[PDB]
Amino acid sequence: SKSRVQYSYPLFYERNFNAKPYEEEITTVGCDDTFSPKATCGLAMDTAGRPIPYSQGFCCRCGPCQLLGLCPVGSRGLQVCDIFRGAALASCLRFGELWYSGYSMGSATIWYRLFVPAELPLVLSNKMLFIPSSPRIHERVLAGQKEWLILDKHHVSMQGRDCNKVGVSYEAFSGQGSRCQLIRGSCLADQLEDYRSSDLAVEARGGRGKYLARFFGDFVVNNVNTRLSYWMRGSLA
């Protein structure tokens, strides 16, 4: 007669997020950062053949990094002063092999069959669910729910205009103030890979994981009419 309490949330696809974006450095004719296909990083294009703004990266020369103790250790410009002075180095935003699908979530809707509940349903509205989506044949994609991640929307940059957030893109990468006097790889911190790695390490240390979906509970994704559901511990009142 009695059934278990169920909590379902509607899933809303947002975009694909790269697991670990990285900065490729190209040694240099000379360094070209012009909005043309002649650029060192090269121009990226949408499926319509339109150039993606800020995709050509930027060049960095020694510059004021010449002056002892002005630029921080490991900065873009400083690397030119030391190994390639006179020349310029291209900073290119590149995307890793692995990609995740980002889903926004709605409100929890209770379910039963034969009122105050035992456990209160978790707020998933202000969070985002990440599921490995490509290259498909990849270990992580095959690994299923084990590899899903759940982050607060605060850690996500939807449009990619914000540095050190999930979904960071060309707009945030160039457009960094004083970019050449900044550390190599700046802006590409706190990514999905970092969120996973931080959990796996803390887990091996016998600590509480905070990002992977498994630390939130055991879920089920059904393609009805798509929803994300979990079973509440306990029973009806």
Author numbering: 99 to 126, 129 to 214, 257 to 367, 371 to 382
Pull verbatim passages from the article behind this deposition:
HAPLESS 2 (HAP2) is a conserved sperm plasma membrane protein that is essential for gamete fusion in a diverse array of eukaryotes. HAP2 is homologous to the viral class II fusion proteins, which fold into an articulated rod made of three β-sheet-rich domains, termed I, II, and III, with the central domain I flanked by domains II and III in the prefusion form. Domain III connects to the C-terminal transmembrane domain via a flexible linker, while domain II bears the fusion loops at the opposite end. The crystal structure of the C. reinhardtii HAPLESS 2 (HAP2) ectodomain (CrHAP2e) revealed that this broadly conserved, gamete-expressed transmembrane protein has the same three-dimensional fold as class II viral fusion proteins. It was proposed that, like its viral counterparts, HAP2 initiates gamete fusion by insertion of fusion loops into the opposing gamete plasma membrane.
The resulting purified protease-resistant 40-kD fragment (termed TcHAP2esub) crystallized in the hexagonal space group P6122, and the best crystals diffracted to 3.1-Å resolution (crystallographic statistics are listed in S2 Table). The crystals of TcHAP2esub consisted of domain II with a short extension into domain I. There was continuous electron density for the loops at the tip of domain II, and we could build the polypeptide chain unambiguously in this region, albeit for a 2-residue break immediately after strand b (i.e., in the bc loop). Monomeric TcHAP2esub domain II displayed the same conformation adopted by domain II in the trimers of both AtHAP2e and CrHAP2e. We were thus able to superpose the TcHAP2 domain II on its counterparts of either the CrHAP2 or the AtHAP2 trimer with reasonable subunit packing, suggesting that the postfusion TcHAP2 trimer would look very similar. In contrast to AtHAP2—in which the bc strand connection is basal to αF and away from the lipid contact area—in TcHAP2, both cd and bc connections are located roughly at the same level at the tip of domain II, suggesting that, together, they may comprise the membrane insertion element. A surface representation of the modeled TcHAP2 trimer indeed suggests a relatively flat membrane interaction surface with a tripartite nonpolar patch comprising V129 (in the N-terminal side of the bc connection) and L167, L168 and I183, F184 (in the variable regions 2 and 3, respectively, of the cd connection). As anticipated from the aa sequence, the loop preceding α0 is stabilized by an extra disulfide bond, numbered 5b (middle inset).
